[PDB]
Amino acid sequence: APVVTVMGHVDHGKTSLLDYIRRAKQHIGAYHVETERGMVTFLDTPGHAAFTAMRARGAQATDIVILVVAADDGVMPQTQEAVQHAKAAGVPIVVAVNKIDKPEANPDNIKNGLAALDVIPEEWGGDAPFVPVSAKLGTGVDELLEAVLLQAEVLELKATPSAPGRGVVVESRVATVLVQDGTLRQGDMVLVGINYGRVRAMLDENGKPIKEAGPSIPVEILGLDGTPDAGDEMTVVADEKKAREVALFRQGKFREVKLARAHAGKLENIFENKKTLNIVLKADVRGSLEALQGSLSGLGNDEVQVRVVGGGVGGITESDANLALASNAVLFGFNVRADAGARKIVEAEGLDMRYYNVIYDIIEDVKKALTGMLGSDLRENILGIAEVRDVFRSPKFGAIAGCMVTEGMVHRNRPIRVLRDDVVIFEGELESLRRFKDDVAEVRAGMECGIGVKSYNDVKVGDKIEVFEKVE
């Protein structure tokens, strides 16, 4: 009885397939279906973003993952990101073409498009299965439900019924847990993550009250003193003082491990702490991604092997940061900046995150990291940010844009970058800046000004302008 997570591109059929499967044989976070070949359960929330977030806390609540693609407009970049996320942990991947109920959409380019992703099918090399399904039409459910269990061909031992409570939390709305090992008879003391309580309500997916929990079945518990996190682990204790002592020891241990990760996980400590140095790469364009991947694929043979575990085009989404945290890798943003959630995750944990705007710099830094004598605190710094709120261009010289300066100081003697959607578009120099039509040469923090950049008039609303100095 494995655990299934649905993964795929947006608007491809993940929710539709999950709903059809549930209806064939009240949203809490998980559900289960009984089949003659064997019971199989699914998690309500699909997508790799939620899958890796709980992965990052060592939960490992996945057994088999299924990709859903479409015969039309198939294998989009998010599908590649999802398969990367599934392979980083390491699980068998079962793929399924969903929209095979379209006006002659051929499920043939999908196979040889996904083949060049280490998802080689059976008829090609014999590595992964391919199934035609259709949530709308209904043809293909039986094949998928047989293949999900057929490809689950590991020992699958343990999960002993008579065992102490051991499960993982899913959704802390009252909460829900999908227990891995043991039984969850109500009334006994329970330690759910950093939390203590007693089992008073033990509702099921359909709301029918029960008292016993299956080996790999979900259950919604209610009665705890509050709300734990979404990736913690739950067990059974006996003494409330024991639970409190365990909670305080967990505070101490987490506070120690955060500093240990922020220390050893930096790029500067690669040689000291093989080890198969992992990196997570983000680039502004596909060419600068492929070139960097080809350069970083081979670097050092006898000592340390560098393998890229990510690779995407756009800003540093919090899913990318969660993947890097789970894989304990090093961020690498080439001409791309992080978002708010990525900034939050990087601030919380260690997450060595360094930016670059030159291809050679990344190879140089990685070579020194493998060598072990790299220099620290180099390659410029950020000294000011402004947000563009209005762009006006008179028909005599149109380059001025109104900007609100946020958390920094913008000046005239330093080069600038202009970026949209956390992606840079131009890196030149500052031509003019003025307040109240007065040509001031220094704008403080929190102020408002009018900025015009030389030899570039394309600024729009909601941009960002960063000012930096090459300091060595």
Ligand SMILES: Nc1nc2c(ncn2[C@@H]2O[C@H](COP(=O)(O)OP(=O)(O)O)[C@@H](O)[C@H]2O)c(=O)[nH]1
């Ligand atoms: N023709 C056809 N349309 C489908 C099929 N499956 C899903 N759809 C449509 O595609 C959309 C899928 O959206 P959905 O998967 O729920 O969004 P997501 O959860 O963000 O991926 C739905 O609005 C359906 O109407 C199918 O097998 N055939």
